[PDB]
Design a binder for this molecule. Sequence first.
Ligand SMILES: *[C@@H]1O[C@H](CO)[C@@H](O[C@@H]2O[C@H](CO)[C@@H](O[C@@H]3O[C@H](CO)[C@@H](O)[C@H](O[C@H]4O[C@H](CO)[C@@H](O)[C@H](O)[C@@H]4O)[C@@H]3O)[C@H](O)[C@H]2NC(C)=O)[C@H](O)[C@H]1NC(C)=O
Ligand SMILES: *[C@@H]1O[C@H](CO)[C@@H](O)[C@H](O)[C@H]1NC(C)=O
Ligand SMILES: [Mn+2]
Ligand SMILES: [Mn+2]
Ligand SMILES: [Mn+2]
Lengths: 150, 272, 84, 94, 242
Amino acid sequence: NRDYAKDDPLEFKSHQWFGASVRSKQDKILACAPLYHWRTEMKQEREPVGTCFLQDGTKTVEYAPCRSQDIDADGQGFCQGGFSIDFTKADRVLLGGPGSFYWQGQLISDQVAEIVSKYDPNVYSIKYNNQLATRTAQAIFDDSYLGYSV
Amino acid sequence: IDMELVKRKRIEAIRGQILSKLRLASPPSQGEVPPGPLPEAVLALYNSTRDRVAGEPEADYYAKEVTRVLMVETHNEIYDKFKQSTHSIYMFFQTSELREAVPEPVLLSRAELRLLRLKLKVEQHVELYQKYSQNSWRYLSNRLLAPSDSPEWLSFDVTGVVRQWLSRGGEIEGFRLSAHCSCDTLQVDINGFTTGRRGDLATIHGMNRPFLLLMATPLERAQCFSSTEKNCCVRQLYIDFRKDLGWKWIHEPKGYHANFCLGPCPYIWSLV
Amino acid sequence: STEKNCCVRQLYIDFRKDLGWKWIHEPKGYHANFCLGPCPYPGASAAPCCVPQALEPLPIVYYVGRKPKVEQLSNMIVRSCKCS
Amino acid sequence: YMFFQTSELREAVPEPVLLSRAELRLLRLKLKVEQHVELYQKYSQNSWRYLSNRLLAPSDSPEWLSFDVTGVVRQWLSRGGEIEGFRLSAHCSC
Amino acid sequence: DYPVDLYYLMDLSASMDDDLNTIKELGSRLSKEMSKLTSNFRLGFGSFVEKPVSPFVKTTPEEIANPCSSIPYFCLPTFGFKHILPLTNDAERFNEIVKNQKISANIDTPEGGFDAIMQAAVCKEKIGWRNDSLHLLVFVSDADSHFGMDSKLAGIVCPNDGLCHLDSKNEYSMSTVLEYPTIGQLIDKLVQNNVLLIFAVTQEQVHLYENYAKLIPGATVGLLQKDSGNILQLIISAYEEL
Ligand SMILES: *[C@@H]1O[C@H](CO)[C@@H](O[C@@H]2O[C@H](CO)[C@@H](O[C@@H]3O[C@H](CO)[C@@H](O)[C@H](O[C@H]4O[C@H](CO)[C@@H](O)[C@H](O)[C@@H]4O)[C@@H]3O)[C@H](O)[C@H]2NC(C)=O)[C@H](O)[C@H]1NC(C)=O
Ligand SMILES: *[C@@H]1O[C@H](CO)[C@@H](O)[C@H](O)[C@H]1NC(C)=O
Ligand SMILES: [Mn+2]
Ligand SMILES: [Mn+2]
Ligand SMILES: [Mn+2]
């Protein structure tokens, strides 16, 4: 577990369920941890934003599109990104996040060329320009679990 | 010698005191009261009267029935005209429950509006206003703020306001909270709605909202001049310096009225 | 400290124990205290007494038949004591 | 705006601890209508910080008021600042 | 004249603070009209909130012991289901439990309602269902409720066996171990025990649960009001038998 500060752990990889969904495309292997919790960068929380690790041969990168500044249940704090995954034929990743926006759910798609290139082990909230995402809707759609399967 | 019964003289003086402030002769019946159920609604009343560490007559010796009323949420009327902004904060109340806790405007004794602070650090200054003509706002009081690292509970004596609200049949009232104006914005964090908290816990996020604490006299009570005898009444006594002291070293003044207290004060005497 | 002069003495008053009152739900006891002590050399009264200077109110909870009334008594808890 | 000299203040009261009560008294002339008054203190010889407040009543005769600035005067006798003062403006509606 | 059992399943979740006083006025009122149409009357009680695991509850050390934090407010921790009162004739013991009930909390509006229905149904012993009687189970909650496979997000993939899982504390011990039950599982265990499920929810939740009562045989619905005698009219017109 990386530390945000002294005696202040940044993440909780225990019981993160890494390997709950595995998807492979050619020499690419994508695995995710839907029960990965992450502490907010504003205060001391424990929010299950989910994270994925991608291996394209030698390089291993992290992918947490729900680990953002959009915190709390109202945002992507309980997104559990990587609950379900799949690959397209044009090297785009399809990620499902059932807990986003008070469990309205969200689908996030990023180009594999951008995932590895914009990866930075010192940046915990990476913003991707070619990101495609289902934005938040009205409150009637809460508790819908969009992204449960893909 | 004195003895320790002095404590028992206080207890038996407390006994007759509580009964007199409640205008009671004997304790009421508790066989018409159900043992066990104690609502957390009256526990919030009792907790809010003991809470005030912050904030600034013949009828004033008797007891006052303490009741409170919560405010109106932002889900009905507080968003239709202004909503919330960095310039002001609005709180709204009804009157069908204000004139229900205190039916007659005269019964109202003290009415303090209490809020809930959040950590604010160094300094802020707050000015309070009242709703006039349903559109104009009039100044009330002001208060400087201290660096409380913890949530703080305040109170503002708006008794003169609430009394005027009980005399009119005005079906809607409310307050306004802006900040100081240095002339020749607002940075206070008070417990609010935040607008966006949802889920199962959202319902409890309306608790601790600004409420108006009321202390009135029950309707059941209603209703040297109180004595024909020379009671402990202050007696007249004019003292001259040249006449009663013989001191010519004091030029001014040359006399004043230094009264005195004469009369007994006993208790628990024979015969209600 | 142990004062020989006008000092406010501690006194916890229980309703069930020192009064026998089970009709007051809350509280079931409080610190009213009292003032005991001499005040030597200063006026107005023929004998300067140890009287309280600051007092504090007490909220009570009792029922009336079927109606519970939360009321607050004025000046019950003796904080300070003066001599006048 | 009102100003005073510290060279005479620390002569009537040498030690700041001796100061017990220091109330600033003025003199009213206007007798008609009612107005709202705010009081400030001199800081950095340019900035003014809030102090107290008082509403005024339409008294038919010249009235004499007073503002308790004891906590202000006490700190001024400890400082070597030989120039201080007060400010009396009106209400600011914002 | 015929024996009748009534189990009172109350939702203690956070959305119930506005509905709390209606339930206590429903308990005492129900603890009176039952002795009228029958003499063999025994009633019980049980409470539920939510499965005490992320993401349904926040996993910060303060919000575990006090899930009403950040408001702030003091409330009971999150628990799956607690069997408090076995059904008995002692009726003033029933009232004394409903009065002292405090609110709990969680995050997600739907609750673990079915977990409490399933444990109260199957446990014919720790609840104490009569041999030949009308096994009536009043279900009260002001929100939706979780069913099967909803616990997959929490990491619970072992299905609900529909058995009695009440520990020495009379709580649902296998709440973080088993999935929520489905309408199929509930239907399969509400008949093996012969249980008539009364839904007593809020207005916005009726259009939902009435379609559940259409699936669940014998299970009916009800509306919650300040005068909770509305739900009493259900039970009295359910003593028709014949
Ligand atoms: C109105 O006020 C009354 C009392 O004036 C209040 O009843 C009391 O509520 C407090 C809640 O703060 C109870 O205190 C608790 O006591 C238990 C055991 O005695 C503690 O475990 C509790 O600790 C909590 O907080 C800890 C963190 O500081 C956690 O680690 C812990 O797990 C608990 O969550 C807490 O101190 C007190 O027991 C009751 N009094 C009685 C007689 O029961 C009432 O709730 C108030 N009403 C309101 C606020 O609406
Ligand atoms: C029901 O009958 C069984 C035997 O058939 C018996 O063991 C049990 O005690 C009975 N239950 C009650 C409540 O009488
Ligand atoms: Mn709920
Ligand atoms: Mn509710
Ligand atoms: Mn829930």
